[PDB]
Structures are given as structure tokens and as C-alpha cells.
Amino acid sequence: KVCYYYDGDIGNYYYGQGHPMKPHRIRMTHNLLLNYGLYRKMEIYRPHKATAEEMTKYHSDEYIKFLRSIRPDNMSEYSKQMQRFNVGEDCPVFDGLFEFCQLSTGGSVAGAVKLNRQQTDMAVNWAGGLHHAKKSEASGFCYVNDIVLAILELLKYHQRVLYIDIDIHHGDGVEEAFYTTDRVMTVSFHKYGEYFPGTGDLRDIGAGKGKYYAVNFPMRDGIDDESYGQIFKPIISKVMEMYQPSAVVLQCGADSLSGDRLGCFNLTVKGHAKCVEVVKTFNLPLLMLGGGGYTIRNVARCWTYETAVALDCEIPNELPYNFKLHISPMTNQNTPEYMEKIKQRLFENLRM
Amino acid sequence: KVCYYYDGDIGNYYYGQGHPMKPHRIRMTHNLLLNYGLYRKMEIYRPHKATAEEMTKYHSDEYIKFLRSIRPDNMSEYSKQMQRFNVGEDCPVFDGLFEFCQLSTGGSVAGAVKLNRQQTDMAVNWAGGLHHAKKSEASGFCYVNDIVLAILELLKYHQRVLYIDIDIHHGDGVEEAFYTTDRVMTVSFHKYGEYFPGTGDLRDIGAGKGKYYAVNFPMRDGIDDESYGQIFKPIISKVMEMYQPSAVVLQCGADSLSGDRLGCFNLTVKGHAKCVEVVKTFNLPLLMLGGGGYTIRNVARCWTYETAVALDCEIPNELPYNFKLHISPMTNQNTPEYMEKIKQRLFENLRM
Amino acid sequence: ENYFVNYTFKDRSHSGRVAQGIMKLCLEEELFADVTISVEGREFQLHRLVLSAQSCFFRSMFTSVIVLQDVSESVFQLLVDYIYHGTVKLRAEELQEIYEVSDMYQLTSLFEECSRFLARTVRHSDPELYTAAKHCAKTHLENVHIYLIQNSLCHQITAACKHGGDLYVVGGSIPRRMWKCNNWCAPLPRDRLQHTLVSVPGKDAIYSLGGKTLQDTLSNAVIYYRVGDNVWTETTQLEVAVSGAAGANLNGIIYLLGGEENDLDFFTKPSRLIQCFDTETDKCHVKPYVLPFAGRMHAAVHKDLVFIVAEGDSLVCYNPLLDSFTRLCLLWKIASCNIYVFRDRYKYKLDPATSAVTVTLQFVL
Amino acid sequence: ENYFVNYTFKDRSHSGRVAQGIMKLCLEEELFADVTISVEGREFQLHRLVLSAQSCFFRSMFTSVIVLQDVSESVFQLLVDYIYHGTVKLRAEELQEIYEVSDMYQLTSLFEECSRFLARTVRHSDPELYTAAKHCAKTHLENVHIYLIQNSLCHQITAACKHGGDLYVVGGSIPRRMWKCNNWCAPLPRDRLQHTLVSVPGKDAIYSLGGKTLQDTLSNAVIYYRVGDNVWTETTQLEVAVSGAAGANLNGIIYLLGGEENDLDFFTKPSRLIQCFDTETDKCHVKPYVLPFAGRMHAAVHKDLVFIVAEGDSLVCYNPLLDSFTRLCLLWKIASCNIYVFRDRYKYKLDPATSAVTVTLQFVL
Ligand SMILES: Cn1nnc(-c2ccc3c(c2)[nH]c2nc(Cc4ccccc4)nc(N[C@H]4CC[C@H](N)CC4)c23)n1
Ligand SMILES: Cn1nnc(-c2ccc3c(c2)[nH]c2nc(Cc4ccccc4)nc(N[C@H]4CC[C@H](N)CC4)c23)n1
Ligand SMILES: [Zn+2]
Ligand SMILES: [Zn+2]
């Protein structure tokens, strides 16, 4: 029941020399397709480039009117608004900045629509995973936030949606965009403490009618699979039974594994394959997006088998010519009496 | 050009025994009218009780549907939403909770409409001054935020509005309701540092397209008029010339004077009369609302002459029988090299 | 000056060595005596140089075969053990005998310590003993000893303090409101929960050291209230943030005991710490000594010591000058007046001389 | 035990008194001599008890009219001044003469101090002097002395460090990226600006003490990187948050100098502080000594001392053991190897023996 959405030329927009984020992450991910049998058993599609009218449902119209203008030129005129939208320094400006994000969110809402008509029950669009962007500004190399648009698309057909993010960085925009609403359940497993987002603490949960409608797991350095899976599975096992939901969204950040640049965690090969697999047992409809990921080699090799675990067919460890596809899981400051404490805190918060 | 709006029975809604906020603050304020000549030279009006349809322009419909139900009874049923809207513990529930706020915002938007047709150029409605409330929750004894509704009313006829708050507590809701927008300039002179709001620091200014569209002045204990006025006047003198605005809103918190319960500042009689007077010289249209204020005696005696300074007629110091109407301005931790530092910081931020 | 040509090399180890070698080479392997002391017929080889360097009476004595009468042999042995090793395990039996002679032989340190002993356990040119004896006039044959929690005070209470009879209670609908039950006050200009309300009469004021914030963070801030002017001024901060810690005053200094501290960057763990705020120097420090008992402790001041009770029937004495504990044996709260332990879970005065107890909730202070 | 019946009264003032009285009653008002010492015909009334208590050779000598030959009168005067007052203003002229005799007369403290003097300014049973002399083999007649900022490293740099030849530079597009110019590293798991990158070879690792956060707050956090395993582990925090502070290592200990500190609850003021992190005990403390010069300082390590330059042409020496400054006279940055001051505003080796200088930008370290 796999309907895999692959953008034809997503990996054609450069991001900068020696720049952390790499739009080639998704190309090298699926570009083991020259000897990939699963594609015969998979329905491959192409995404429809989303228009500004669909994107302005949440983003302020001025933001979209701004976004469709930037280029390697046309910066001096907008230098008074470039600093009013946070673009330029952290999230830079590259060629086709209004094309890559537009097509990614188009694919995301295409999968959302496909699930909306009960056509299929699982849909993956690895070109999503931009959860940092906000209503009026961009942050964390995320200009257009696909997750929020997909959730808005599902908000009418379904009244209860999950967002599960195992990305190292906290999902702020994907949480602020529905903070006050009581319809969406956001869950993020992030490193707190003088890290990038600076938010998503243990205490910043809910707002007004959206009170308690959020879950944050602040981890630390050197987490391992033997504890990460045991601390991760019961959170969904509890939230699903306590939310009586309709559909889920699976943001799978592949920067949360070993050897990743800017990646503090250290997860094994099969340790990562517990979010894309244990989520399937719940039998609910599911979007699947991919977020940030660096160290192209490992972020792609580990990504190869995410689809396989999402479709339930084992891919032999000896991969094609297109070295091996195995990794290792240093110290672990995540004391068991600390992770257990946070797990109990989350369990007590959800029961409220 | 005085058009004074006085609610007939605002002081008929109790707030609790030994409770800090007192709805009788506004009654004893104008209830020196038995020998108050200025009323002959003033046009007294009555406010129209605002409907829910007008208030739901910003507040979420669920919030207003909630608000029109609470009473000394009907609490157990909403006990699952009473904690989802922050009501009950800090901001309690009293008789006519959906009447006092409704009439106050009705008067506020009545003054807004009167200024909107160029009828008059100054309008005072001391029943406003609820700047703590938020879109989905209540905070600081503020259920319905009149300032935000008035600013929304003015947002169509005028494209540039000021909000100036000299209340001790930071104005959060009146700032969060237009944080991302670039149309309204909010300015609040508050005590920061483990105080009530916990926000409005020197660094929390702007959001997205509303970047730099906010101003926060964190003061400390024991401020005096001789420095407060000199640190206060140039802020407006700069913001007016740098904003090219249309209209202003003057939130006048009378808890920011000497001897006030929960009031740390210590201001003199004529020291307070520099926001309701120096604002008039700018010649722009102006709303005037009154915020929190305690120690009924002083918060009323000092309020008596605010209208007089707003109309430019001296009221003899010997007031009627309806003791004196004079106060004193301890230590001052507001070091001049600290207030000067913050003044320079604000001057450099506004120029951006 | 320049360390490569000449400089002054002062050492703090020199005193330690000229003490330890002196101690080791007299009490054992007696040598270079040069003096013979008679103590009711006992012959002592007391070395000359060591003496007179602490007792001026022995200087006068040995400025160009001795008698030294009116002295107890055992007390003189104790005196020599002091003068030679600095360490004496004194006992209540030999107190007065070791007192009068020591004030005679110009031993300032021993004079002070026996004066403190007599003032604690209850003529010469010292004021401390005279004032201590004068203060013991209430029992030679006006104010309530301890204030419970007869009034009601329906307002919610989160902290209280005493200043000699004036019960200043933080509370109300909003905690910042301060109520006075003498025989109202300036509002507290801070949002604090579980703040330590010390009352040091030496610099008469009320201090609000430590607390929790509305953002659920620990407050390492001290703000003081001047009694005579209702001025909630601000003083130097603490060193480690705490909340719900015990507080006790002693001759100006304020001691902050235990409480909760920041654990794992998000939570609060019970702490066993000693903090000192010098209400005269306006400086804070943390004592290296750590309490054996941690948790929610209540402390009381008795004479020159502090009793602390944390969890159970074990009370921990504390002498700030000696930095040592007695650790007697027997949630409770200690109130020291004229001591008395009160059980919080109410489902009795104490005598510390023999650790014997006699038998006869919100904020006992 | 119970303080009301018996307890042990130990005093730290006893050593101070048995030092000060000894010092006062020999060098002045000589008494109880009992010994006569001949120093090339000079008669000394050296008291017996004081000696032998520090020099065992004098114990052996005076265990049941002396000669004591092969000793300089002035050096013996210095030795007596030491043994009696503990304070000697030594000079380079009388170093070796005061060295050999002191190792003879079992004076451990003086032995160590003259060994340090000889190792600094450049046979017996000590390793320190032997190792120091052996280390002075590069000039008896392989690595760059200091790494500038020939490579380019176009990536933005905000911090750098050396570990013996391996230039580990924090930088890149995002500062967390760590570049290695030996002859890449594990990502820094913290968001820091102006962090002090210490490299202590004794517990070989790289420490990132202090810094600024993305929320514009000062980071009082220390995280260390193990060299052999690329493990960015975390260690105990600092005591006072700082940013852009100078850092210098000395025999394991890491010294954090100056920087900026939290002023007025919202801003940063230049600080003049001394912080010590014991990379073996893993504990932090703040030294009471305060630098005369505040601001943005750069420190260098030379022998057993540290040169600090803050603002202008005034360099401030610092001996951590002696807790004293020389305050020589002459934005700069000091780099001590084989010293050399480099001017930041480039619009030259140093000799500290006579304060004479010879004449011959981002991160000089
Ligand atoms: C314009 N204006 N005038 N006065 C106020 C105002 C209003 C309220 C408070 C206040 C000031 N200071 C306060 N301090 C505390 C102490 C505290 C510290 C840490 C954690 C908890 C409590 N708790 C307050 N209320 C609680 C809030 C939570 C709710 N569950 C119960 C009620 C308030 N605003
Ligand atoms: C998903 N994801 N992957 N990587 C990142 C990410 C992206 C960016 C940064 C980052 C991580 N860590 C960082 N640390 C610093 C150090 C610093 C501390 C205190 C004050 C200033 C700077 N500055 C960063 N950028 C600035 C932000 C302000 C802007 N005016 C210029 C660029 C970033 N997110
Ligand atoms: Zn990420
Ligand atoms: Zn107020």
C-alpha cells in the first residue's frame, strides 16, 4: 500500500558552500533505485507544485508576497524586510527558494489529500520535514512549513491529528501554528539546553484552549538505542490511547543518528527503525516526512531502509554498487533516573 | 473637546473579599462630581454594552461562548475548561463577569468610533485598561481586553496607532494581540524581574513582520518623578517623530504612584500628570483608558486631577467634602547610569 | 617587585610547621627543657620559649626553682596540653577550675572559650560572661515564647517571621501582601514562593532570601525590608538558589540551611548546604561543612548553637564557630526558647545537657 | 560529643599565635637563647627549641661551642630570618648560596622555593630541578611556536585552541562545526559564543568553559572533549558566568581571567576575576585576588607564572602560588614561548629579567 512521492529535481537547488543543510539529502536517499526492487512493489508518483493561494491559508499574505521575489539579486530593495523576516543570515537565500519549498509542500498536501479520501493508509513524502518556520519569519533553514499546511488540510476531514518528531531540534513552528488549538497533538523529542530552538522545555506546554496539547522530551548527549526505544515507544503507546485520534504525522529526522554533523545523539541502524515501524502497528492513517540531516553518506545510508521498514520487506545488508551499511551506537549523560523522571512527568501530564 | 464616558453602574460587580483588584476604583474616581465644575464644561455620555459579535473579532469563538456562562454557580460542569482558560484561581469568577467587561469594551469602542469620525480629538474612558487578557485565556484580573478591540476598531480608519502604558505590570496581551503586525506601536513601562507578567524584557521585541514594533522599559523599585518624567518624555518625543502616526491610546495605570498596594514605584502628585498632559501636545487623536489601581483612597485622589490635566483647567487643591490631596515621592535602585543605558538602548532600537 | 631579581616570599605553611614540630618535639621526646616546674610535687620539663609567647604572665615570670602555687595538678596538665598542642578535650567538671587560672595567665583564646562555656551551660574583666549572667534574670526566682501558625487570619499564608513580638506574615489573596500582627506593611516587590524570612535584630530588618518564581525557577535573590521606614530595599544576591530552606540568625549572621536546589536542569532535589549572609558586611558565602540530614529541615537557635531537624527523630547540633556536629538521637520542627520539638503529623521540652527529653503545623516560627 | 558535658576544642588560631609570638620574642628582645652559634666569628643567640623543629639536621646536632663551617654569614642570616619569621626577601645574587645549604639543613619549603627559582630564572635528591634542567635542551647549542589566526580557512572563526600542534578551531557556517588543522572533530553539542577553549594536556582534553547563548545570556557551563575518543562529555559547571575570558593552563589547573559578566540584570560589564578549574579534582573556585586591569585580556604562561595584558602597555604578572602581582610597565596580546606581545591594531620578544623589550589578529592562540 506504498504510494511514494519523489520530486523530480528536488536536488537541483544549491544551499551554499560549506553550508550545513544539504538539499541533496533526499536525492542520494532514494537514488539507490538502480537496484532497488521495492519500487516495483511501490506506486511512485510526482508532486504538484503548490500555489501561493494554498500556502497563504496560515502564512500572512505579506510573507508569501515577499517569498516569491528573492533571488541571487533583488536583495538591496528588500534589505529593510530581509531583516524583518529573519532570512539572509541563518536561513540563506539561494536559487529557486520559492520552488523547492513550494513543491515540497505540494507533495505533502498531495499525500494529505490521498489519505483524505481513504485511498491508502500510509503515505511517505520525504521532502517535507520543515517544522521550524513560523507565521511571519523563517528559522532553521525552513522557509515554508509543510507540516502545518498538511495538518490544516487534514483538519477538516479529521478532527484529531498527531505530529511526532524525533528530530534533534525542537519543533517550534509546527507547535506554535496550533499552540492554542485543542485539535492537534504535537510531540517532539529534542535536546533542550542552549541548543538551536531555545524552546520546547519541559514546562512550555499548551496555551489557553490548547493547554496540555503538546509534549516535549528534553534529552541530552550520547543517547543510545537500548534506552531511546524503551523511552520512546510508551509515549506513543500512551498518547494514542489517551487521544482517541484519527491520523498521525511522522517527522523522521535523520540527523538523530550517529556521526551526524551537528548531531549529538548516537543511534544504531536498527535503533532508528522503531519510529517508522512501531507507528504502523496503530493501524491509523499516517503521513511521513523527512527533516534535517547532514553527513550525506550516513544520513542517506540510514535513510535507505526507512522505506523498507515502512513497507515490511527486508532489504539485504549487502547494498548495490550505485563500504557497508552498518554503524555503531562514547558516554551517555542521559541518566536512567532522569529519563525515567521525564517519562513519569509526561505520563502524569497526559493524564491531565 | 472633552467627551467623557462614565458607566452608570460599573461599581456594582464585587470582586471578592480582601481581593487586590477593586471595581470601585472607577466609581470613587469620578464620584467627586457633587462639587465638580468641570462636568458643566464636559459632555458626559453613557456606554453601549458591547455584544459578543463585536468581541469575537479577535477572541476565539469558544472563549466568548465560555465567558457568557460562568456565575456563582455553573462551575463544576466547566471545571474541565475553567483550568483550560486560566480562570478561577488568579482571575476569579464573580457576579456579572460578562457584563462589566462587556460594557467597558463597549465604552472603549464607542470612544474609538467617536474619534473615527473626526467628531472630537480626545476621548477618555477610564473603564478600559485591561491589557493582560489573551486570545484564549485570562490573566491579571483581565477577562476581556478592551485595548485590543479598540485598536482593531481604529485599524481600518487609521493605519498607524500607538499604545502607551505606564502601568507597573507589563502589557502582554495588548502586545501579543498585534505582535507580528507592523501597524501598531506598543510601549510599556513596567518592572521586569520576577514580577507578575514574567515577560516584556529588554530583548523580547517584535515578531516577524512586526519585528521592532514594540518597546519595553524595565524599571526597578523606588523610582521618582524627577527622573521618571525625564526618562519618560523623550521616549514618546522620539517614537512619534519616528512613526509618522495617526492616533494614540493612553493606558493610565494609577497603581504606579506612591503608597499603592502591590505598587513598588513612588510618584508624586504632579509627577504622574506628565503622561496625560505631554501626550496632548502632539495634537493627534487619543483614546484614554484606566488600568489597575489599588489603595482606593490614593488611587482615587490622584485620579481626580487626571481628567483636569486632560482638559487644561486647574482644580483648586482644596477638594470638596464629597485630609488633603497631596502625597510624597525611601531609596531608588534605578541608578541614573542604568536608566540612561536603557534609554540609549531604546533610542538605538527605534532607529532600526 | 620583579620575580626574576628579588621578591618577598611569605608562606602560610611556616606557621603550620612551627606549630606541628613544636607539638611533636615536646609532648614526645622531651628536649631543650631548660626549666623545671613544680605542680604539688610533680616535676615538669616545660620548655621556656614556647611559654611566655602566649602567656605574658610567664614572660614577666621568666625575665631574669619555681613555686606556682594555687593550681590544680590536673588543670595545669590541661593547660600545658593546650599551650603545647592547642587541642584540649575539656569537660564540664573541670570548667571553672580551668577558667579562673586561664584569665590569670593571659590566655585570651581559652578565656573566651571558657566564658562561652559558662554562658552556654550556665567577676573577671570580660563583658561577655557578665552580660550572659545578667540575661539569666527571667528565672531568678512579658512576651509569648513562640507564635503558633488567638486570631484567625483567613488569608492564605506561605511564610511568616517574628521580630520580637511582631508577627509579620507574608500572605493574602496575592502572596505579596504583608500582614502585621504586632502585639500591614509595605508590599513585597517580588514574586516569591517558599522564601526564607529571616529577622536579624542587629541590623534590624527583615530578609527574604531564596524562593521560587512564577516561571518555576529558583530565586537566588535577597531583598530586605527596613523596619523603621517600610522600605523594601534590595541587597546582594545569594550564591546558590534555594527554596523552602530553614533560616536562623546568630549575632548578625544569617544561616540558610538545606532546602531544595536545581537538579538535572529542570527539577528540584533536596539539598544539604550551609549558607551564611553577613548582615553587616553584606556578603554571602557557602560553608564547606555539609549537613548529615537533607530534605525539609527546621532550625532553632539556642545560646551559641543551632539545632536542626530534617526527617525523623535525629536532631543535629551545629556550632558555627567550631564547624562540628553532635548528632544526638531521640517531620518535626525545633523551637528553641528559655528547646522543644513539635511533630508536624499530629496524629515536650528538651534538655540538651544529658540528651533527656520531657513530655508535657503550617509555620511554627 | 555533647557540648554541654565535654568536647574537643581545636583552634586554628593557635598556630598563628605560636608563630607570631615566636617571631616577636626572638628577632627583638632576645631571650631564652641557651645556644651560641659561631658564623665566621659572628656570635648568634639562636634559640634552641625553634630550630630542630624545622631542620632535622639541627635535631641530630643538638641531641646531647659549635663550629658550623662552610656557611656564608649573610646566607646564614637569611636562614635565621626564615626559620624565625618565615618571610625572606630573596635576591638572585644569593640564590645558589641559599640553595645548597637549605637542602642540607632539611628545609623542604625553602628547598622547593629555590628549586622553583632556579627552574624559572635558569645535583641534589629532587626531580623538579633535574627535569627543568633537562627541558632546557632546545638551546644547548620541530614544531611551530605559535599558530597565527599557510592555510586560508574561509569558514568564519569564533574560537581556536592548540594541543601541541593540532589547531582545533571552532567555526564554520554554524559555530558548532569543529575544524582540525593537525600538522574535523565531533560536533560541539552546545550553542556558545565567546567560549574559552582551554587545552590541559595533563588530563588530555579540550574544555569549553564559559560563553554566550543564542538568547543573549551568559553560559556558566563547562563541557569537555576527550581527545582519544571524540567524546564531547560534560563536566561540572562554573561558579560565575563569563564570556570572552582569557584562559591559561598550569600543571592541570585551568585559570579563567576576566571577560564580561552580568551587570544590571540585562547587560554585560567587563570583569576582573580569577577562576580556577581543577581538571583533576573537577572542582571550580573563584580566587579572592582581583586583577588590577579589567576588560578584554589575553594571558600567556611562562614557567611558573602568567603574564596578562588587558588594555594599554601595562602587563600584569601573576604567580598562582604566591597570589601576588609584579605590575611591570612598558589592545595587545601576550604569547609566551621559549614572551612576545603583539599589537591588535597593526597600523618583538620580551625579557622579563630586567623588564627590557627587544624589537625585531583574530586569535593569536
Ligand atoms: C495586575 N495584577 N495585580 N496583581 C496581580 C497578581 C495576580 C496573581 C499573582 C500575583 C500578582 N503574584 C503571584 N505570586 C504567586 C506565587 C507563586 C510562585 C510560583 C508558583 C506558584 C505561585 N502566585 C500568584 N497566583 C497563582 C498562579 C497559579 C495558579 N494556579 C494559582 C494562583 C500571583 N496582577
Ligand atoms: C535545524 N538546524 N541545523 N542547524 C541549525 C542552526 C542554525 C543556526 C545556528 C545554529 C544552528 N547554532 C548557532 N549558534 C550561533 C552562535 C550565537 C550565539 C549568540 C548570539 C549570536 C550567535 N549562531 C547561529 N546563527 C546566527 C543567529 C543570529 C543571526 N543574526 C545570524 C546567524 C546558529 N538548525
Ligand atoms: Zn534537525
Ligand atoms: Zn497594573
Handedness of CA A37, A40, A41, A44 (dihedral sign): positive
Solving technique for this entry?
Answer: cryo-EM
Tell me which residue has cell 525557577.
C217
Whether C171 maps to a domain, the answer reads yes
Q: Give the residue on A whose Cα is nearest the Cα of C215.
A: A203
CB contact under 8 A, B218 and D216: no
Whether D158 maps to a domain, the answer reads no
Tell me how far apart the alpha carbons of residues C181 and C179 are, in angstroms, rounded to a whole number: 7
Q: Which ligand 1 atom is at minimum distance from the Cα of C193? A: 18
Q: Where are the alpha helices (DSSP H) in A117-209?
A: 146-157, 173-176
Characterize A161-193 residue by residue with b for buried, 16 or more Cβ atoms within 10 angstroms of its Cβ, and e for exposed. bbbbbbbbbbbbbbbbbbbbbbebbbbbbbbbb
Candidates C38, C65, C66, C34; CA nearest to C50 is C34
Tell me which residue has cell 531521640.
C330
Tell me how far apart the alpha carbons of residues B263 and B313 are, in angstroms, rounded to a whole number: 29
- Superfamily of segment(s) B3-351: Histone deacetylase domain (3.40.800.20)
Active site (annotated) includes residue A132: yes
Helix, strand, coil shares, percent, chain A, to 5: 35, 10, 50
Both D211 and D350 in one domain: the answer is: yes
Tell me how far apart the alpha carbons of residues D324 and D333 are, in angstroms, rounded to a whole number: 21
Both D107 and D37 in one domain: the answer is: yes
Tell me how far apart the alpha carbons of residues B125 and B120 are, in angstroms, rounded to a whole number: 14
Closest Cα of chain D to C161: distance in Å?
29
Both C126 and C189 in one domain: the answer is: no
Please list the active-site residues of B: 132
Whether D326 maps to a domain, the answer reads yes
Helix, strand, coil shares, percent, chain C, to 5: 20, 30, 50
Nearest CA to ligand 2 atom 26: A90
- What single string gives the DSSP state of each residue in B152-204? HHHHHH-S-EEEEE--SS---HHHHTTSS-SSEEEEEEEE-SSSSS----SS-
Both C102 and C238 in one domain: the answer is: no
Return all residues near A70 (Cβ < 8 A) that are at least 6 apart. A78, A82, A87, A93, A97, A98
Whether C1 maps to a domain, the answer reads no
Ligand 2 first shell, C-beta below 6 A: A 20, 89-90, 140, 169, 196, 262, 292; D 174-176, 191, 193, 212-214
Candidates A189, A106, A215; CA nearest to A150 is A106
CATH of the domain at C173: 2.120.10.80
CA C69 to chain centre: 37
Both C99 and C213 in one domain: the answer is: no
Cα of A244 to ligand 1 centre, how many Å? 35
Closest ligand to the CA of B261: 1
Determine contact, residues A255/A294, Cβ cutoff 8 Å: yes
Tell me how far apart the alpha carbons of residues B105 and B173 are, in angstroms, rounded to a whole number: 15
Residue C193 three-state SS: strand
Whether C150 maps to a domain, the answer reads no
Q: How is residue C355 written as a grid cell?
A: 540528651
Nearest CA to ligand 1 atom 21: C214
Residues in chain C: 365
Q: How is residue A201 written as a grid cell?
A: 522545555
CA-to-CA dists, residue C17 to C13, D13, D60, D222, angstroms: 6, 14, 18, 38
Both D77 and D215 in one domain: the answer is: no
Report how far apart the first and last C-alpha atoms of chain A are (Å, whole number). 37
Give, to the nearest 10 degrees, the angle between helix B97-116 and helix B146-157: 20
Tell me how far apart the alpha carbons of residues B102 and B174 are, in angstroms, rounded to a whole number: 17
Q: What is the DSSP letter of A209?
A: G
Tell me which residue has cell 529588554.
B202
Report how far apart the first and last C-alpha atoms of chain C are (Å, whole number). 57
Q: What is the DSSP letter of A55?
A: H
Final residue of a structural domain among D135, D154, D186: D135
Cα of A301 to ligand 1 centre, how many Å? 53
Backbone angles phi, psi at B96, to 5 degrees: 60, 40
Chain C CB within 8 Å of residue B333 CB? yes
Residue D158 three-state SS: strand
The residue to mutate among A93, A174, A196, having the most atoms of ligand 2 within 8 angstroms of its beta carbon, is A196
The bridge status of strand D341-343 relative to strand D274-278 is unpaired
Residue B127 three-state SS: coil
Contacts within 8 Å (CB) and 24+ apart, D229-233: D229/A330, D230/A330, D230/D185, D230/D186, D231/A222, D231/A330, D231/A331, D231/D186, D232/A221, D232/A264, D232/D186, D232/D187, D232/D188, D232/D189, D233/A221, D233/A222, D233/A330, D233/A331, D233/A333
Tell me how far apart the alpha carbons of residues A20 and A29 are, in angstroms, rounded to a whole number: 17
The residue to mutate among A90, A190, A199, having the most atoms of ligand 2 within 8 angstroms of its beta carbon, is A90
Whether C364 maps to a domain, the answer reads no
Task: Return residues 176-235 of A near B (CB < 8 Å).
Answer: 180, 182, 207-211
Both C168 and C128 in one domain: the answer is: no
Backbone angles phi, psi at C278, to 5 degrees: -85, 100
Q: Give the residue on C whose Cα is nearest the Cα of A339.
A: C264
Question: What residue type is assigned to position C328 of the chain?
Answer: L
Tell me how far apart the alpha carbons of residues A50 and A148 are, in angstroms, rounded to a whole number: 14
Candidates D195, D299, D189; CA nearest to D242 is D195
Q: What is the DSSP letter of D93?
A: G
Q: Give the residue on A whose Cα is nearest the Cα of D227.
A: A330
Q: Is the CB of B285 under 6 A from ligand 1?
A: no
CA B352 to chain centre: 27
Nearest CA to ligand 2 atom 34: A140
Return all residues near B273 (Cβ < 8 A) that are at least 6 apart. B305, B306, B309
Determine contact, residues B263/B222, Cβ cutoff 8 Å: no
Facing A331 at nearest CB: one of D176, D215, D231: D231
CA-to-CA dists, residue B266 to A248, B190, C170, angstroms: 56, 13, 22
Backbone angles phi, psi at B84, to 5 degrees: -90, 0
Tell me how far apart the alpha carbons of residues C234 and C220 are, in angstroms, rounded to a whole number: 12
Nearest CA to ligand 1 atom 1: B140
Chain B residues whose beta carbon lies within 8 Å of the beta carbon of residue D264: 335, 338, 341
CB contact under 8 A, D264 and B202: no
HEC readout, C84-129: HHCCEEEEHHHHHHHHHHHHHCCCHHHHHHHHHHHHHHCCCCCHHH
Determine contact, residues C315/C307, Cβ cutoff 8 Å: yes
- What single string gives the DSSP state of each residue in D219-280? E---EEEETTTTEEEE----SS--BS-EEEEETTEEEEE--EEEETTTEEEE---EEEEETT
Closest Cα of chain A to B262: distance in Å?
26
Q: Is the CB of B89 under 6 A from ligand 1?
A: yes
Tell me how far apart the alpha carbons of residues D308 and D328 are, in angstroms, rounded to a whole number: 10
Give, to the nearest 10 degrees, the angle between helix D127-135 and helix D108-121: 0
Q: How is residue C293 written as a grid cell?
A: 540530614
Which stretches of A146-302 are assigned E, i.e. beta strand?
A: 161-165, 184-191, 214-219, 247-252, 286-290
Tell me how far apart the alpha carbons of residues B284 and B271 are, in angstroms, rounded to a whole number: 23
Residue D351 three-state SS: strand
Handedness of CA C12, C13, C16, C22 (dihedral sign): negative
Tell me how far apart the alpha carbons of residues D191 and A196 are, in angstroms, rounded to a whole number: 7
As separate numbers, helices (DSSP H) first and strands (DSSP E) second, chain B gives 11, 8
Both C93 and C217 in one domain: the answer is: no
Report how far apart the first and last C-alpha atoms of chain D are (Å, whole number). 57
Q: Which residues pair with A164 in a beta bridge?
A: A187, A250
Both D127 and D243 in one domain: the answer is: no
Closest Cα of chain B to A209: distance in Å?
5
Q: What is the DSSP letter of C190?
A: S
Both D202 and D347 in one domain: the answer is: yes
Tell me how far apart the alpha carbons of residues B236 and B122 are, in angstroms, rounded to a whole number: 17
Facing B198 at nearest CB: one of C172, C215, C229: C215
HEC readout, B65-106: HHHCCCCCCCCCCCHHHHCCCCECCCECCCCCHHHHHHHHHH
Chain C residues whose beta carbon lies within 8 Å of the beta carbon of residue A341: 264, 267
Whether D163 maps to a domain, the answer reads no
Tell me how far apart the alpha carbons of residues A246 and B62 are, in angstroms, rounded to a whole number: 22
Chain C CB within 8 Å of residue A338 CB? yes
Q: How is residue D325 written as a grid cell?
A: 602581582
The bridge status of strand D211-212 relative to strand D223-226 is unpaired
Question: What residue type is assigned to position B328 of the chain?
Answer: S
Both D205 and D89 in one domain: the answer is: no
Tell me which residue has cell 549572609.
C277
Q: Which residues pair with D211 in a beta bridge?
A: D219
Question: What residue type is assigned to position B128 of the chain?
Answer: G
Determine contact, residues B131/B251, Cβ cutoff 8 Å: yes
* Domain ranges for chain A: 3-351
Torsion of CA C337, C338, C344, C346, to 10 degrees: -150
Q: How is residue C196 written as a grid cell?
A: 526564607
Tell me how far apart the alpha carbons of residues A249 and A286 are, in angstroms, rounded to a whole number: 5
Cα of B201 to ligand 2 centre, how many Å? 21
Q: Write the burial class of residue D270 (CB in 10 Å: 0-12 exposed, 13-18 middle, 19+ buried).
A: middle
Tell me how far apart the alpha carbons of residues D183 and D167 are, in angstroms, rounded to a whole number: 8
CA-to-CA dists, residue B11 to B6, B14, B103, D242, angstroms: 11, 8, 12, 54
Tell me how far apart the alpha carbons of residues C243 and C260 are, in angstroms, rounded to a whole number: 5
Q: Is the CB of C210 under 6 A from ligand 1?
A: no
Return all residues near B150 (Cβ < 8 A) that are at least 6 apart. B105, B108, B109, B111, B112, B128, B249, B287, B289
Backbone angles phi, psi at C38, to 5 degrees: -105, 125
Candidates B207, B196, B185, B105; CA nearest to B150 is B105
Candidates A312, A253, A238, A310; CA nearest to A279 is A310
Candidates A176, A327, A336, A185; CA nearest to A247 is A185
CATH of the domain at C131: 3.30.710.10
Q: Write the burial class of residue D173 (CB in 10 Å: 0-12 exposed, 13-18 middle, 19+ buried).
A: middle
Closest Cα of chain C to B96: distance in Å?
21
* Domain count across chain D: 2
Tell me how far apart the alpha carbons of residues D362 and D365 are, in angstroms, rounded to a whole number: 9
Whether D174 maps to a domain, the answer reads no
Give me Rg for the CA atoms of chain A.
19
Greatest Cα pair distance, chain C, in angstroms, is 81
Q: Is the CB of C212 under 6 A from ligand 1?
A: yes
Q: How is residue D192 written as a grid cell?
A: 556558545
- What single string gives the DSSP state of each residue in C283-323? EEEEES---SS-SS-EEEEETTEEEEE-SSS-EEEEBTTTT
Determine contact, residues A10/A104, Cβ cutoff 8 Å: yes
* Cβ neighbours of A256 (radius 10 Å): 30
Tell me how far apart the alpha carbons of residues A317 and A324 are, in angstroms, rounded to a whole number: 8
In which domain, by residue range, is D109 found? 13-135
* Cβ neighbours of B338 (radius 10 Å): 18
* Cβ neighbours of D323 (radius 10 Å): 12
Sheet with strand C157-161: strands edge to edge: C157-161, C168-171, C178-180
Backbone angles phi, psi at D212, to 5 degrees: -115, 150
Chain B CB within 8 Å of residue A83 CB? yes
The bridge status of strand C205-209 relative to strand D356-357 is unpaired
Tell me how far apart the alpha carbons of residues C250 and C301 are, in angstroms, rounded to a whole number: 8
Both C325 and C181 in one domain: the answer is: yes
Cα of C216 to ligand 4 centre, how many Å? 22
Q: Give the residue on C whose Cα is nearest the Cα of A345.
A: C267
Return all residues near A105 (Cβ < 8 A) that are at least 6 apart. A50, A54, A55, A128, A144, A145, A146, A149, A150
Q: How is residue A185 written as a grid cell?
A: 497533538
Q: Which residues pair with C306 in a beta bridge?
A: C301, C318
Q: What is the DSSP letter of C340?
A: B
The residue to mutate among B90, B191, B299, having the most atoms of ligand 1 within 8 angstroms of its beta carbon, is B90
Tell me how far apart the alpha carbons of residues D43 and D138 are, in angstroms, rounded to a whole number: 48
Question: What residue type is assigned to position A5 of the chain?
Answer: Y
Tell me how far apart the alpha carbons of residues C63 and A24 are, in angstroms, rounded to a whole number: 97
* Cβ neighbours of B318 (radius 10 Å): 7
Nearest CA to ligand 1 atom 9: C174
Q: Which residues pair with D277 in a beta bridge?
A: D254, D284
CA-to-CA dists, residue A243 to A121, A189, A231, A238, B216, angstroms: 19, 19, 19, 9, 40
Closest Cα of chain A to D144: distance in Å?
28
Cα of B90 to ligand 1 centre, how many Å? 6
Residue C207 three-state SS: strand
